[PDB]
């Protein structure tokens, strides 16, 4: 089916985002933000829907994503949270922008 093929494309993108090739800028997005650990006591007041690649991986493994759009919405939410919370000149924002460039260019090659 088309939905199967498009979700294989998404799974390939997910595997690439988690790969050693992108680890230098992808690592901030590997696991949920631990606000308490970092003293970011405003994080959950500002970010109502946290997202990270471990959560995307769990949802893909559990067949939670019914289509590519649902997968893309979660990956883009992860970047949006980073752009919303952090000052735009912070290193983590530069790293989000680099990983989003990897995501958007490969996502755009979606099989019809
Ligand atoms: C204990 N947590 C961390 O130190 C790590 C996690 C360690 C476990 O794997 C996931 C990342 N960071 C990244 C960290 C950082 C600390 C605080 C403020 C912003 C980023 C970072 C990034 C880039 C460069 C230097 N440091 C975060 O939680 C993290 C990530 C994102 C996307 C974010 O928006 N925020 C606010 C925090």
Contact (CB, 8 A) for 67 and 7: yes
Long-range contacts: 62-68, Cβ < 8 Å, 24+? 65/7, 65/10, 66/3, 67/3, 67/6, 67/7, 68/6, 68/7, 68/9, 68/10, 68/107, 68/110
Nearest to 96 by CA among 112, 108, 84: 84
Domain total for the chain? Answer: 1
One-character DSSP codes across the chain: -HHHHHHHHHHHHHHHHTSGGGHHHHGGGSS---HHHHT-TTHHHH-SS---HHHHHHHHHTT---SHHHHHHHHHHHHHHHHHHS-TTSHHHHHHHHHHHHHHHHHTT---
How many CB atoms are located within 10 Å of the residue 8 CB?
A: 12
- What CATH number is associated with residue 111? 1.20.920.10
Q: Name the residue at shortest CA distance from atom 24 of ligand 1.
A: 92
Q: Is 33 left (phi over 0), alpha (psi -120 to 50) or beta?
A: beta
The span from the CA of 12 to the CA of 59, in Å, is: 14
> Which experimental technique did the depositors report for determining this structure?
X-ray
Instruction: State in Å: Cα 110 to ligand 1 middle.
Output: 30
- Sequence-distant (6+) residues with CB within 8 A of 57 are 14, 18
Whose structure tokens read 């000052």?
87
| Domain of 85, in residue numbers | 1-112
| Residue from 24, 28, 54, 97 whose mutation best tests the ligand 1 pocket (most atoms within 8 A of CB) | 28
């Amino acid at each position: 089916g088309k939905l199967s093929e498009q979700l294989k494309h998404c799974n390939g993108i997910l595997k690439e985002l988690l790969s050693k090739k992108h680890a230098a800028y992808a690592w901030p997005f590997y696991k949920p933000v631990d606000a308490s650990a970092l003293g970011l006591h405003d994080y959950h007041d500002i970010i109502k829907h946290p997202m990270d690649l471990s959560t995307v991986k769990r949802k893909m493994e559990n067949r939670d994503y019914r289509d590519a759009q649902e997968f893309a919405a979660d990956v883009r939410l992860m970047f949006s949270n980073c752009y919303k919370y952090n000052p735009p000149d912070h290193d983590v924002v530069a790293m989000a922008r680099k990983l989003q460039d990897v995501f958007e260019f490969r996502y755009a090659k979606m099989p019809d």
